[PDB]
Amino acid sequence: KYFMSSVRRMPLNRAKALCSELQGTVATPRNAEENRAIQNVAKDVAFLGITDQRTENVFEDLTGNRVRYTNWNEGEPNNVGSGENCVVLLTNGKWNDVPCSDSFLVVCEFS
Amino acid sequence: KYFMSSVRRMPLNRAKALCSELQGTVATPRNAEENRAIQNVAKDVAFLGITDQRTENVFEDLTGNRVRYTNWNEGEPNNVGSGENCVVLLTNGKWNDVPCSDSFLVVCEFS
Ligand SMILES: CC(=O)N[C@@H]1[C@@H](O)[C@H](O)[C@@H](CO)O[C@H]1O
Ligand SMILES: CC(=O)N[C@@H]1[C@@H](O)[C@H](O)[C@@H](CO)O[C@H]1O
Ligand SMILES: [Ca+2]
Ligand SMILES: [Ca+2]
Ligand SMILES: [Ca+2]
Ligand SMILES: [Ca+2]
């Protein structure tokens, strides 16, 4: 598994399109080791390939597989405002759910 | 080095933008092993990061570094018509110079 980060920010739909263009997907850490590797390639807050768009509070990857390993920041996920169904990896390595329409860097994963 | 192929076709400038978006560059094979590795991922004719834009018949990689290894198809490079200053890897692994404005798949290189 190889991780590459974008230089520009974009919403999740554009992020998915970017990783998909090179036949990869938005990065989804499956353990602490991958979480750190992703954090390291990302120089700022970046999107992960995890959402609870299908079912609220049920987080799964972009292929529908419910995630097992999580690393939520204290107080997250909180689905605040009108809702937050996407996930970003903070600069300290913890996760926060955010609106999928907001823009962040993207880390793509390839195998 | 890791090589990934795009799914859509695009001109060289767009190909460069795609690869650089994930901090990589358009694939430039430095030997037959890498040439074969690029073949493995390119399901159809694809752009390589080489051009003779500066001086006709002097091929350099995208950073203006003159290349050493080449694998031209018989009869190539022929700079047909108004000129062909970009390079693509054919499905047999041999190269052909083509117009930089024409669209082809792109293979990106990372390391
Ligand atoms: C759009 C955005 O950044 N919203 C975040 C929210 O997701 C997070 O739960 C909260 C924690 O205090 O901080 C807000 O700023
Ligand atoms: C746009 C294009 O594909 N032009 C190619 C040209 O680059 C190549 O040298 C020649 C060899 O016969 O075949 C042409 O079709
Ligand atoms: Ca939610
Ligand atoms: Ca939140
Ligand atoms: Ca030429
Ligand atoms: Ca030619």
From Swiss-Prot, chains A, B:
Disulfide bonds join C19-C108, C86-C100. It is found in: Secreted. It comes from the Eukaryota. Residues 1-109 form the C-type lectin domain. The coiled-coil domain mediates trimerization. Calcium-dependent lectin involved in innate immune defense. Binds mannose, fucose and N-acetylglucosamine on different microorganisms and activates the lectin complement pathway. Binds to late apoptotic cells, as well as to apoptotic blebs and to necrotic cells, but not to early apoptotic cells, facilitating their uptake by macrophages. Oligomeric complex of 3 or more homotrimers. Interacts with MASP1 and MASP2. Interacts with MEP1A and MEP1B and may inhibit their catalytic activity. This is Mannose-binding protein C. It comes from Rattus norvegicus. The chain holds residues 133 to 243 of 244 of the full protein.
